[PDB]
Design a protein around this ligand. Structure first.
Ligand SMILES: [Cl-]
Ligand SMILES: [Cl-]
Length: 432
């Protein structure tokens, strides 16, 4: 009397649709019906209801195995694995090579009609349908005829009516032999003429974007500061922000006073810099930033001197860390710099897309290296099995063929600093 066996073609994954339901696959039963039990290799997966079962043995050549899935609301495939235990010997049944355990790969397909919602940084409004620009798929830099069709894949075009900031690197926009020869000339504080270059100033572009937002959100406090504080003479022109929308690429040097300050007076170290250094430099006096540039604005030093800094630096390396930190930042009305080592790189993030499970699926990025006057979408993905594992967050550039995985190291955030402003104002009215 031979011992029965079971076989399965492991080259074949079992791929149920995204819909909820009880799905099946077949296992071939050789020389009779082996007494075994199927098991998921992880029992704690929330999108599978219970253990798999043998739902039919009536065909002498095959068993039917059933398992039940919840609907996959996410835009990602999700994976599970079934192994088989010999009920008499207690051993796992072997696969075709006689060495590895027989393992059936389950991959539930992604939701093709997801309901997406969005969260934007406080105070910048939100894109209208006319401001959302769909994107073509590229192959080795050449655009194809196809488009990315996921609803969250769009560029947020800058118009006269939009309220985000995206200062771009002149050194990248510059077209040698087409742009004017005075393209990099800045009129400085003492009206001196300066040729400012910014090829490695992504930390400063991100800082400038966040400071434009901060000056706008705190416009009224800043007006009271100019009326009430004893302003240092040389700093008087710096107590405003100008960001002029609708300029051609050739006029980018005339677009932003804050960006121009960094470009005229800070540094362009090829190694890079840090978002938080540029933010501190602009806002209050700290010894670490003493030699960041040839001047030190430190414009509101007596508002933030001996109190909470509105600047924070937070690291993330798991999916849970990334989502908690993004949600905390967005829900607390703060602006967002994203950094990573790769040289230290930096971009600005103005919002995020979410699926119906509230996973973050896309970020909307001001990328000072990219040419268009838009925010670009960066898809968000996580290493490994998000249902089991830390799941290192990473993002990627939809605008590129074969985008490199960008492992986010952390966020640098800028708070409005309302309590510090109120205390400064209250202290003034008390000294009346
Ligand atoms: Cl199980
Ligand atoms: Cl708003």
């Amino acid at each position: 009397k031979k011992k029965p066996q079971i076989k399965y073609e492991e080259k074949q994954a079992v791929m149920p649709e995204s819909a909820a339901g009880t799905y099946t696959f077949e296992v071939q039963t050789i020389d009779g019906k082996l007494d075994y039990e199927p098991y998921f290799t992880s029992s704690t997966l929330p999108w599978i209801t219970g253990a798999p079962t043998i739902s039919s043995r009536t065909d002498p050549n095959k068993d039917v195995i059933s398992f039940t899935c919840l609907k996959n609301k996410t835009v990602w495939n999700r994976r599970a694995y079934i192994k088989f235990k010999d009920k008499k010997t207690g051993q796992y049944i072997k696969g075709a090579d006689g060495k590895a355990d027989l393992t059936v790969n389950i991959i539930q397909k992604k939701n093709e009609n997801p309901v997406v919602h969005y969260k934007w940084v406080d105070g910048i409004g939100a894109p209208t349908e006319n401001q959302k620009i769909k994107m073509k798929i590229k192959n080795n830099g050449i655009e194809t005829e196809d488009y990315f069709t996921d609803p969250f894949v769009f560029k947020w075009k800058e118009t006269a009516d939009t309220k985000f900031y995206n200062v771009r690197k002149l050194d990248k926009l510059y077209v040698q032999g087409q742009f004017p020869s005075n393209y990099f000339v800045i009129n400085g504080i003492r009206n001196e003429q300066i040729q400012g270059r910014d090829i490695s100033q992504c930390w400063a572009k991100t800082a400038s974007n966040m400071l434009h937002w901060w000056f706008e959100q705190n416009k009224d406090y800043i007006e009271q500061y100019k009326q009430k504080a004893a302003i240092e003479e040389w700093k008087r022109p710096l107590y405003k922000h100008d960001y002029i929308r609708g300029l051609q690429d050739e006029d980018e040097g005339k677009k932003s006073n804050i960006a121009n300050i960094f470009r005229a007076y800070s540094h362009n170290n090829a190694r890079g810099g840090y978002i938080e250094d540029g933010l501190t430099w602009y806002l209050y006096k700290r010894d670490g930033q003493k030699n960041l540039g040839s001047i030190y604005p430190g414009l509101f030093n007596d508002v933030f001197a001996h109190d909470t800094s509105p600047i924070n630096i937070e690291r993330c390396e798991t999916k849970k860390e990334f989502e908690q930190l993004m949600n905390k930042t967005l829900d607390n009305k703060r602006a967002i710099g994203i950094f990573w080592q790769g040289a230290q790189h930096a971009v600005t993030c103005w919002g995020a897309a979410y699926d119906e499970d509230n996973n973050i699926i896309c970020l909307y990025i001001a990328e000072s290296n990219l040419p268009e006057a838009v925010l670009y979408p960066f898809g968000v993905r996580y290493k490994g099995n998000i249902y089991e594992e830390k799941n290192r967050t990473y993002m990627f550039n939809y605008a590129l063929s074969k985008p490199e995985n960008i492992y986010i190291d952390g966020l640098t955030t800028l708070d409005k600093g309302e309590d510090q402003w109120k205390k400064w104002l209250e202290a003034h009215q008390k000294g009346e």
